[PDB]
Amino acid sequence: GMTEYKLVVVGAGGVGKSALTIQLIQNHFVDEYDPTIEDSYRKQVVIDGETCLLDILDTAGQEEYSAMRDQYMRTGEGFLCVFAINNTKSFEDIHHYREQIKRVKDSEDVPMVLVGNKSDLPSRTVDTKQAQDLARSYGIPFIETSAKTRQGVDDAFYTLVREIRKHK
Numbered sequence: 001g002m003t004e005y006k007l008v009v010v011g012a013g014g015v016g017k018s019a020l021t022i023q024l025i026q027n028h029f030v031d032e033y034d035p036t037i038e039d040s041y042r043k044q045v046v047i048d049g050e051t052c053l054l055d056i057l058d059t060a061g062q063e064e065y066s067a068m069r070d071q072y073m074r075t076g077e078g079f080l081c082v083f084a085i086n087n088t089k090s091f092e093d094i095h096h097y098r099e100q101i102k103r104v105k106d107s108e109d110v111p112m113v114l115v116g117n118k119s120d121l122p123s124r125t126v127d128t129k130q131a132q133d134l135a136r137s138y139g140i141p142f143i144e145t146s147a148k149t150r151q152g153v154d155d156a157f158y159t160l161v162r163e164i165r166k167h168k
């Protein structure tokens with residue numbers, strides 16, 4: 001049977017969660033996607049020669065710590081924690097996203113990748129060393145991406161699948 005991997009993309013509003021998801025789905029950069037739309041999208045891909053089905057939840061909206069939202073997020077098998085390299089606040093939020101993921105999964109071992117998006121921009125405020133060091137602190141991979149140019153997009157999603165495979 002073809003394995004399906006449920007991946008959830010999280011991070012502050014405006015970091016490029018939708019742009020990254022749509023680059024994976026459409027193979028096209030979408031600079032404008034209603035920031036309120038939270039939805040899921042599937043794609044069949046080959047990852048290391050194995051054809052699998054990805055189901056990508058692109059999160060959006062206000063925080064809500066409720067039984068129903070926790071249940072929806074608990075469906076995720078792996079998470080991309082996305083910040084933008086020109087937005088320090090988005091980077092400072094990362095620990096909170098990781099903490100909430102571990103809380104809903106009730107696990108100290110949740111497949112996760114740190115993603116530094118907007119790598120095409122010159123306006124960097126978060127050094128690559130700081131981001132690599134954050135991923136090292138938490139023992140997770142770090143991928144530099146640009147939804148604009150497609151830099152890192154497969155690397156981010158496919159690495160997360162590799163992390164789910166290691167966990168399962």
Ligand SMILES: C[C@H]1CNCCCN1c1nccc(-c2noc([C@@]3(C)CCCc4sc(N)c(C#N)c43)n2)n1
Nearest residue numbers: 010062063064065069070073093096097100101104
């Ligand atoms: C960084 C904080 C600090 N608070 C002030 C506003 C900014 N923040 C903020 N904003 C918007 C969203 C989130 C946020 N934090 O986790 C999450 C996710 C989706 C991640 C996956 C696991 C769970 S489980 C659950 N119920 C969630 C929810 N809602 C989440 N989303 N956090």
Ligand SMILES: Nc1nc2c(ncn2[C@@H]2O[C@H](COP(=O)(O)OP(=O)(O)O)[C@@H](O)[C@H]2O)c(=O)[nH]1
Nearest residue numbers: 013014015016017018019031035118146147148
């Ligand atoms: N230059 C650049 N802009 C990006 C990139 N990804 C997203 N954007 C822009 O960042 C803003 C937020 O993107 P969006 O995908 O809506 O973020 P979301 O709120 O996390 O879903 C929009 O103005 C996008 O055009 C990227 O990699 N590079």
Ligand SMILES: [Mg+2]
Nearest residue numbers: 017018035060
């Ligand atoms: Mg969005």
